[PDB]
Amino acid sequence: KPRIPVVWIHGLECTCCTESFIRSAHPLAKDVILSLISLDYDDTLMAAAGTQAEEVFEDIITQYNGKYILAVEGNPPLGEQGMFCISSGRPFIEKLKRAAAGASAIIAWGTCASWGCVQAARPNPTQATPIDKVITDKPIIKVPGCPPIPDVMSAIITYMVTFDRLPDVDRMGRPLMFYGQRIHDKCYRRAHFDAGEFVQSWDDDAARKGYCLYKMGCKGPTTYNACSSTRWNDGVSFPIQSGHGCLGCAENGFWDRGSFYSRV
Amino acid sequence: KPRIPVVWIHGLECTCCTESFIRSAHPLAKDVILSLISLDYDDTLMAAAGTQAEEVFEDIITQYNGKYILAVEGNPPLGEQGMFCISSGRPFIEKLKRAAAGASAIIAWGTCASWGCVQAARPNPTQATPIDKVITDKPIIKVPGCPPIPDVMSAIITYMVTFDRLPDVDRMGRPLMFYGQRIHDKCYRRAHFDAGEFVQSWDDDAARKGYCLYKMGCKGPTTYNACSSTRWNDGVSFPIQSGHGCLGCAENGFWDRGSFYSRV
Amino acid sequence: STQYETQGYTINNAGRRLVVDPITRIEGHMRCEVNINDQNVITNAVSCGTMFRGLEIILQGRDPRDAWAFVERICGVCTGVHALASVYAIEDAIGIKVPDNANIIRNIMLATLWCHDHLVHFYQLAGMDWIDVLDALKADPRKTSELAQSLSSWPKSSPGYFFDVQNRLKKFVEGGQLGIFRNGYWGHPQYKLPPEANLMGFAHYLEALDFQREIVKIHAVFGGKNPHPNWIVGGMPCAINIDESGAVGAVNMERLNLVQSIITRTADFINNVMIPDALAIGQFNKPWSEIGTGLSDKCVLSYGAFPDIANDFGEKSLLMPGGAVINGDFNNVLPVDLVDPQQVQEFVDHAWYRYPNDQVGRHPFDGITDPWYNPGDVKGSDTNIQQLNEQERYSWIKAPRWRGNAMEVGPLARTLIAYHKGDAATVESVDRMMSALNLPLSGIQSTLGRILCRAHEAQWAAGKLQYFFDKLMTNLKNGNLATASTEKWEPATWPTECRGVGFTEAARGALGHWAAIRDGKIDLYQCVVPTTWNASPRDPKGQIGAYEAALMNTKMAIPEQPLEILRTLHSFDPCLACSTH
Amino acid sequence: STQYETQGYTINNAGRRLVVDPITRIEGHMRCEVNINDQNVITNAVSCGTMFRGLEIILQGRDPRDAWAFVERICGVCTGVHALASVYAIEDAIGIKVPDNANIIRNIMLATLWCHDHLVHFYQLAGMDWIDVLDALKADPRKTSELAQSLSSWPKSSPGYFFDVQNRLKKFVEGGQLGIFRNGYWGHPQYKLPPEANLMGFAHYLEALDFQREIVKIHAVFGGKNPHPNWIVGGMPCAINIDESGAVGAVNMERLNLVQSIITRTADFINNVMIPDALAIGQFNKPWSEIGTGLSDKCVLSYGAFPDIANDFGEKSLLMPGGAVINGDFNNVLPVDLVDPQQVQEFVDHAWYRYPNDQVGRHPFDGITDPWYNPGDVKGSDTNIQQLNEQERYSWIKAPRWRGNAMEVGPLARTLIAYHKGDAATVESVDRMMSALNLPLSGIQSTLGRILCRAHEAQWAAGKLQYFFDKLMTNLKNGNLATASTEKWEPATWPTECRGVGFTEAARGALGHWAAIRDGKIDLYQCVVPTTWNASPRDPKGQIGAYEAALMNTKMAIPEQPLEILRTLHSFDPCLACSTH
Ligand code: SF4
């Protein structure tokens, strides 16, 4: 019984979203790859290189035209005619456009593909640009975060395979299931916020009792994600549980909203 | 190198605290038994029965007089001359008194040993009585809950072995580390309580969004435990996360504070 | 002394008396006494429950919606089954029908507990009756690897693994602190496994102790915690949201993915560790297919369980069949009705309770729980018992009967009922198991057979977990999300006077709760639990219960070491807190 | 065409030109070109970084306390190492000393990363260069079990397990959907493992893909999440509370117990799966002890890492030694100074950047990052590179040198430095390892040796995790809980102008961050990263970097299938995002 074809491409990025995917606890990434999808192209994991990798890319997008899902990690730079990111001797943007043309739908993994992330922070030397400003004629599901949560990535994949449809999205293209509520609206330190019980300097008595991180710059009040509910790494922790405020890493432009340690 | 001797006895009980202990994720209960302590008497797990079990009990409390920890699960009934709970043809209370006299310290596992639990609820047919109303001359550490959290039980054991001392306690004898704060002071649904966002009937739209359970009877506001932070079963869930209000099960007298579905 | 005949046994209390108190490797408190003749054969057996709490009394005047939480605390080993029977009983009384997903999730809760309970019993409670732990120190690790690999595909079988396990045991005992192994029955002539099979079994004891903690993560997802998950009258409180804002506050795709991962791991452990170990115990202990028969070739009982059609408790809905057999006639599986006053009755002429007439039985809707500690003419005294007097009152356990007959309940009883009703999966499983052992079908009616049926049922329940999970996902794909009916939640909507029955099959056998509601409060709440049946004392005709019958006629090699008594008792998985409540 | 001599090589761009673009099974974007002579031997090799983002430019104007979070995103594979170098650099500039527990926890973060990164590289990135996955379908499962049991005590070795793994691969391939195995190099004559060793290796590939997820739970406890954990200037944010009210809000005994459980499992996997597989690759591929030497017998560099005395970065503190060797003189390990302008310098005459004088090298405190895409004649166009022009600018990677010398960095470099400084543990491990393979010491200076050193270092790091955990627990037993210094948190306490260096050993080699602060903001932030050294283009003297040198002189069996090129490049674990930043 055939599995759905998936092409996974990489622009300007740090590879954190691929690393997050392989951390999945349920289903294991092994079982996603062997039993749920056909991961037919992926630079980080595939055996073939060079001309052999170009043959796989060409063959899959032609054979499965109109029927594969395109996963995108990273983004295209518009500076230097696109040659800040080079793939087979040519601008990355050319490979992005050819892969997008045959896809049935696109998943934009991470803040890079969704919005820009760190390379797009001031002064954006390469003119790094998110996927939806280049590809304008295809369904794009944004899954933001730096990176997104591992078991969120795998839950979105299983939803699409099991239910044979795209997740319903908000006005920005984010899945409602995991991005519909703010971090601060499901945070276990909210009792302390409401009582005016705050950490004021690192490792003070308040910090040692798990008081709220608002005065240390927490951006939870303006950030939509699942970190305070689903949590990270098989439910082990999340940024605030281990004592650091949320940076805002799921939101467009979070690097340029002032210092991480200045109040929301 | 020798391991600390532990004698574990059972009065009137349901055996939930023993079951909770064997659920420990870190350290595994296997490793606690093989490497951390010497579990020298325990009716639920031991090979010997009858006269052979009586010989173990006698030999251990004699050879290790003044040097063993006594763990108690359940409680003694004062009704019918104590013969609502019989061990070796005599009232259980006689075995409790003999075991306590030789102990260096006593751990009262669960709400039964700490306070009374379900058999002590109105009209208390057997006159079930907590440990500290019978044993008045030994240190007693109360670890309440029905049952207590698995990884709380194992963390208290590892603390005592590693640091070679009893945990510091509140005025009721509960370890400060896990019983110093209320469920409601670390609850991830507190944002909803503060906003007046409540479940009003089961499976309403509020329930489907994870709203606060106060109007459904949640007793989190008056209950001290670690369920909303440490959570249950290797961090997988807790009562409120799965949609039921807290019953109050770590607090003295919780069965007789009105219906579980009447507001706190 | 006296002698009388009942149920094909000669009950004779002359001769030497042996006492086993405490019985260990059970839940709760039990005492057993026997008489043995000068041929070391048991001629009399006495089953005594040595605890009582009084839940039926405590429940009076409570809100019916709260009852599940109180009765769940009857037992922490079979955790959840009393909550399930309670919500069933209250829904039957008031006239509540739950949504399909609530029924499917309840069936998942029950199949999870069968898997967990059966696995822990096999290794942690019964295992050391069959596996000589100290003899594992004499095994050859390579020969242990070859044996395990001949029996199973399970990956964990290297010679170096078995050497490492053996060296852990060697270190554990080297300081003379033998812990749970101290003063055991090691070297008794009835231990028949070779050294390599003892080391294989001991390794698996440790693997099962670790793995069992994972199974109950399914209870944590749907029920909040284990032990003692949460439930509601009207369905379950675990609201579902797959594709809307706020799914982070509900049972969502990530939570369901966790459940599926646990189901697959649980099936794999049961099928590749527990099942081959049960068959190996059988291969090396075939004489135990003829010991401990008791009532199992005479009278067996199942109420049935796992309704597949929501709110339908009939024969076309229940996936685990119900029925009764009496007089050894397995050609006549009879239907059970829990409302009929002439079917289930409890007697107290040999128990510590008061009735207006102790020579008759009372159906649970007419039940009375009026405790009366009166041991009579014991050897010793009322606070220092040397020998119970089984001619008078001798237990905190009431004596249930079905149409006046003494019955066995539990995995063997269920397997016999399903086999003789013609359930295809049961017939195929039992036939293949007994063919592998070269034993006749009658070999299942025994102490060995109780153990084999328990392993069969763990494999059956792990398969049903997947079936129920797939049913839930099919409903979600069709947009059917409902988990609670609330139109009769408020007391003002209930009948002023009503009564109901909730029933199921717990791991240990047939469970029922009978409830009467009047003026918004519990008026009567009576429980009859599986170990109440099996551990029962005698009735006015002198008829003996399942434990006492199974112990009759048993040979002991060494009277002072009760290994044969423990093997037979533990084969029933006694739960004494359940039996007395 | 042209030819010149450098470093004992003859660089000759006559003959057939081969292009490999993209290089896969690396992090990020790389292109490689070679020329081969009439005997199919490489006579020219060209390393090209095909991406740039500009973190050094983005960091200007930031608050120094925020810098770690930005530079962490240089790379998601070596996640955390750039945050560590950043907080070290900012603390060096301002004059901050952290508490002992903060230093110990940082060392745990770094050892955890080494274990994770080395394990995933061995299986998921490099493994398929050595294991022929499709040939595993021809293996005998019983002979696979025998091989595995001869090499290790690891439990998971049964014939049924290897049959089940083989069958899963068979079902995966049978429909033609080969996924990551499509159009691979399977059957190439350089695949030398027997079928049983290929099936063992493939089983372990799958086990490692599952297990690696567990290792990073240590980062989740102390750092909140992985990838990309959190840190602070002044220590760590994970406040500790063991025995006071509100320990539920902090690192408590339960959290510490979780960490210990992961440490033990991590050591067992590395020691019993990774280590024996590395030795087996060595046994079946001994000729690769003489291929890919490159600079490893000429010039190697380590900065050192793991300060065991808090805030002391000297020789007596660092548990992983630093030093430099040049001109093949391993009898004189030289000291490294990261402030000395004559030591570390970067050249851009062959890279896509502007300097006022491209014939000189700039120390990082004088660094300039002014991107200039200028490929010259590439036999196509500026947007169509058919052949890079290695006589002019050909990469986004700058060219670092040490005292003007081209150096190799990474596991093999570190092993050689420690061995020749006389570290007793290193000498004994290396000697025992080469003895087991019946190879001379010089065999470690090779493509095979890089792989062997990486596995050895994973074992070393797993041991040091336990050592650091024990050190933390000793402090807690003595009542020393502090995790942050905040005396100089506020900008009003800092010098108006200051500068600092932060350095460590990342999984891939020597890492430095150079920072200048003025008026409370970052004035300059320059990074030199391990793959910047190894993947370097040429300098004004024409000297070649580590990758180009290691490829020189290599025989190719089949020019169109670049397996030998992939084997040698992947042996360095290239991280291209790191190299360009
Ligand atoms: S820690 Fe952050 S998200 Fe949590 S309550 Fe405080 S401000 Fe809100």
Ligand code: SF4
């Ligand atoms: S669900 Fe209970 S503990 Fe949580 S905020 Fe509401 S009332 Fe408080």
Ligand code: FCO
């Ligand atoms: N199983 C179980 Fe417990 C008993 N007996 C119940 O019901």
Ligand code: FCO
């Ligand atoms: N290791 C690693 Fe990444 C590289 N090169 C860094 O620093």
Ligand code: SF3
């Ligand atoms: Fe996963 S590539 Fe890592 S930087 Fe922020 S999302 Fe991008």
Ligand code: SF3
């Ligand atoms: Fe663990 S025995 Fe279970 S009832 Fe409430 S604590 Fe008691």
Ligand code: F3S
């Ligand atoms: S920094 Fe990112 S990982 Fe979650 S807690 Fe804040 S959205």
Ligand code: F3S
């Ligand atoms: S019912 Fe008990 S288990 Fe915790 S959430 Fe409330 S104290």
Ligand SMILES: [Cl-]
């Ligand atoms: Cl790509």
Ligand SMILES: [Cl-]
């Ligand atoms: Cl952004």
Ligand SMILES: [Cl-]
């Ligand atoms: Cl006891």
Ligand SMILES: [Cl-]
């Ligand atoms: Cl109480």
Ligand SMILES: [Mg+2]
């Ligand atoms: Mg009853």
Ligand SMILES: [Mg+2]
């Ligand atoms: Mg740089």
Ligand code: NI
């Ligand atoms: Ni029970």
Ligand code: NI
């Ligand atoms: Ni990197």
